[PDB]
Chains A and B, each alone.
With several copies, the nearest count.
Chain A
Amino acid sequence: KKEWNGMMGELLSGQADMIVAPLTINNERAQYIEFSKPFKYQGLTILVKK
């Protein structure tokens, strides 16, 4: 069974109404949710100790 957890796991169950959090827009999530227009653009990067 393709089950979900986390913010989306509790949202598709209807427990919540709106996820306000740094949630990343992508295809897999958008199947079972909808996303507002992006409010902060970003990329993926690395940290290393200086």
Chain B
Amino acid sequence: TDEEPGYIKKCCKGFCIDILKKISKSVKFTYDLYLVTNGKHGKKINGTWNGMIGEVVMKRAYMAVGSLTINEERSEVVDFSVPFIETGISVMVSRSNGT
């Protein structure tokens, strides 16, 4: 941990990055974008948050991007904007041939 926490410059490509680029263009704000070592969207670990919620609560990162749901537990410590895509618990089926 004494040496530099690895700053591997990678390139990012996805839907949420495009959302971020569009909102940045519309609002004219730049961003130091980085990824968290937790690897989770965030759950209450003994009253402590991690990942997106952990970084936002401790304010090391101002905002969190990605596929983040909106639930009442998360809204306790952070606030969510109007959701842009619709998700939830859904059913996946195999196709059936004709009869």
**Number of residues of chain A lying within 8 A (CB) of chain B:** 5
CB-contacts of A20-50 with B (<8 A): 25, 35, 37-38, 41
Q: Is B73 an interface residue (CB 8 A)?
A: no
Chain A's closest residue to B81 (CB) is A37
**Number of residues of chain B lying within 8 A (CB) of chain A:** 5
Docked-complex contact B86 and A37, CB < 8 angstroms: no
Interface of A is mostly: loop
Chain A's closest residue to B75 (CB) is A37
Docked-complex contact A35 and B86, CB < 8 angstroms: no
Q: Is B27 an interface residue (CB 8 A)?
A: no
Q: Is B83 an interface residue (CB 8 A)?
A: yes
Chain B's closest residue to A26 (CB) is B82
Q: Is B36 an interface residue (CB 8 A)?
A: no
Residues of B within 8 A of A35 (CB): 82
Residues on B close to A: CB < 8 A? Answer: 70, 80, 82-83, 86
Residues on A close to B: CB < 8 A? Answer: 25, 35, 37-38, 41
Closest 8 pairs (CB-CB, A-B) = A41-B86, A25-B82, A37-B70, A38-B83, A38-B82, A35-B82, A37-B80, A37-B82
